[PDB]
Amino acid sequence: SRRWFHPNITGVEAENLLLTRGVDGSFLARPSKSNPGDFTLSVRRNGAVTHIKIQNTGDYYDLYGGEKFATLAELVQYYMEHHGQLKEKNGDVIELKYPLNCADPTSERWFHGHLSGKEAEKLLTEKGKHGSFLVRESQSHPGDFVLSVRTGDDKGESNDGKSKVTHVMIRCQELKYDVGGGERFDSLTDLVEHYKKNPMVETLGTVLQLKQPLNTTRINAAEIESRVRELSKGFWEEFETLQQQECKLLYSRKEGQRQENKNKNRCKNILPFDHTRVVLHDPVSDYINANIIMPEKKSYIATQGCLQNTVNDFWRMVFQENSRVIVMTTKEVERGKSKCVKYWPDEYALKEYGVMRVRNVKESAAHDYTLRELKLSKVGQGNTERTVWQYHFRTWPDHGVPSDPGGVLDFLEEVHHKQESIMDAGPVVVHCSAGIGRTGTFIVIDILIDIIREKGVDCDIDVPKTIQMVRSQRSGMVQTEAQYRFIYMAVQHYIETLQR
Fold first, then answer.
1. Are 395 and 267 in a shared domain?
2. I want to staple 437 with a disulfide (CB 3.0 to 4.6 A). Which of 34, 378, 479, 484 is the partner?
3. Is 364 helix (H, G, I), strand (E, B) or coil?
4. Strands 212-213 and 132-137
5. Residue 266 sits in the same domain as residue 410
6. What sequence ranges are listed for the domain Tyrosine-protein phosphatase?
């Protein structure tokens, strides 16, 4: 699970490892230095290394000469199972067999690295709990490492002597880590994994249990600008630490995989988790590529740009979920490729989509978006009428993110108040194209900002933790580091607008 990702590796280091440590079928994946936000899948095949291009323009991972995916870990899972499916130009089959593991601990949640022994014991005392651990570089003995563990009863600033922090020295020696005796490990990860399964036990009996890492991403909203500064030396280790937790998220997507449903997916392999998918109720198909997103009151439906065949389903869902606000974050066409089919009538025009009937009551033009007031009803029963407000965001660039977050903010702000003005309104429908990159970007910003707007500029927000929570509910939510950074930029910008 993700040991096959090497984050700080050159194309030439890539081939060396594959030729010197590898064998045919061995492979690794790595981030492109030439086209940032793009990646590369390297497979030792026939004594040689072939490299395979993967692009992410912020919507999905496009495997060059393959299919589109939501995450690298879904990508890899797919081809170590649907075999013979990965082929080069000329038909030959590319075999993904042996993950070539990376030994870089930097991306581990529990690895800090350069950190003082005193600054660490503060973190553990202050924010730590029983079984809270961390691994840092040794100042004392350079090149070696130190593992620190809190063990006790309660958490926080305690004086009852019921808790304590214990420090174990980890020696790097001939390129293998050990804790002074016993087995020598190939990586930091392997040592830590070992001692989580098999805790170290102090002579006098204390069990050095490795329960959770120490959170270092949660921050007080008020100080966001200082952390923005810290990370712009940070932002990269932070994004990548988050990216490695995507392997815990390989939940099932069987409904999406059914034959009857394959043409209801924009991208055949980008599918809604079974356990959070939207299930259509009232001889009828129950499938739509849409997930409920719940912060963890207000909730979201993260979905895709409609297809010609799924327009009627979109409206069934909207009616079923009592959604009264839709957020569209894509043009119908971008870069000449179609992104969403027009699921709404022209201004003043009444349309039927299956049993669902929709009137475009009024449009409204604004700098950054178009607002459409739609009246949805069910055919037959003239009492099912409800107003659905469609916020169409016009000004998101074809490539990358907006250079300034103000449009997005003024948009979500207005969306927020529409929702709030309607009692019992259902989840807020959000969609782009594949409904994962832009859609997740928007939803996450809206969540973080709903927290601030409530609790105030004096509260705790944790961006990576929040993004992780959202990804556990729909694959790949928030696609790029560009998008990540933008989320920071936009929350910051939202504080500085509040305190002014």
1. yes
2. 479
3. strand
4. parallel
5. yes
6. 235-490
Helix or strand holding residue 50 (H, E) = strand 48-56
Residues 357 and 453 in one domain: yes
- Residues 372 and 399 grouped into a single domain: yes
Q: CA–CA separation, 408 vs 489, rounded Å?
A: 11
Respond yes or no: is residue 432 known to be catalytic: yes
Domain of residue 22: give its range.
Answer: 1-107
Phi-psi region of 211 (alpha: psi -120 to 50; beta: other; left: phi over 0): alpha
For residues 152 and 275, membership in a common domain is answered with no
> Residue 363 belongs to a domain with what CATH number?
3.90.190.10
CATH number at residue 14: 3.30.505.10
Contact 149, 209 (CB under 8 A): yes
Q: Which amino acid type is present at position 344?
A: W
Q: Breaks in the chain, named by the residue before each, with C–N above 2.5 Å?
A: 233, 282, 296
Task: Say if residue 479 is in the same domain as residue 499.
Answer: yes
Helices (H), 139-278: 188-197, 224-231, 235-243, 254-257
Tell me if 11 sits within 8 A of 33, measured CB to CB: yes
Contacts 24+ apart (CB under 8 A), 53-59: 54/29, 56/479, 56/480, 57/399, 58/399, 58/400, 58/401, 58/437, 58/438, 58/479, 58/480, 58/482, 58/483, 59/432, 59/433, 59/434, 59/436, 59/437, 59/438, 59/479
**388: CB partners within 8 A, 6+ apart:** 318, 323, 324, 325, 326, 358, 373, 374, 375, 376
Q: What span, in angstroms and rounded, lies between the C-alpha atoms of 381 and 366?
A: 35
CB atoms within 10 A of CB 163: 20
Known binding positions? 398, 432-438, 479
3-state secondary structure of 63: strand
Select which of 102, 340, 432, 459 is catalytic.
432
Distance of CA 99 to the CA centre of its chain: 23
Tokens linked to 430:
């959000």
Experimentally, how was this structure solved? Answer: X-ray
**Structure-block tokens of residue 93:** 């089959």
Residue with tokens 């095949």: 45
Lookup result for tokens 């009852």: 160
Radius of gyration over alpha carbons of the chain, in Å?
A: 25
Q: Number of folded domains in the chain?
A: 3
Say how far apart CA 374 and CA 362 lie, in whole Å.
8
Residue labelled with tokens 């940032």: 36
Its sign, for the CA torsion 262, 263, 267, 272, is: negative
**Residue type, position 478, single letter:** V
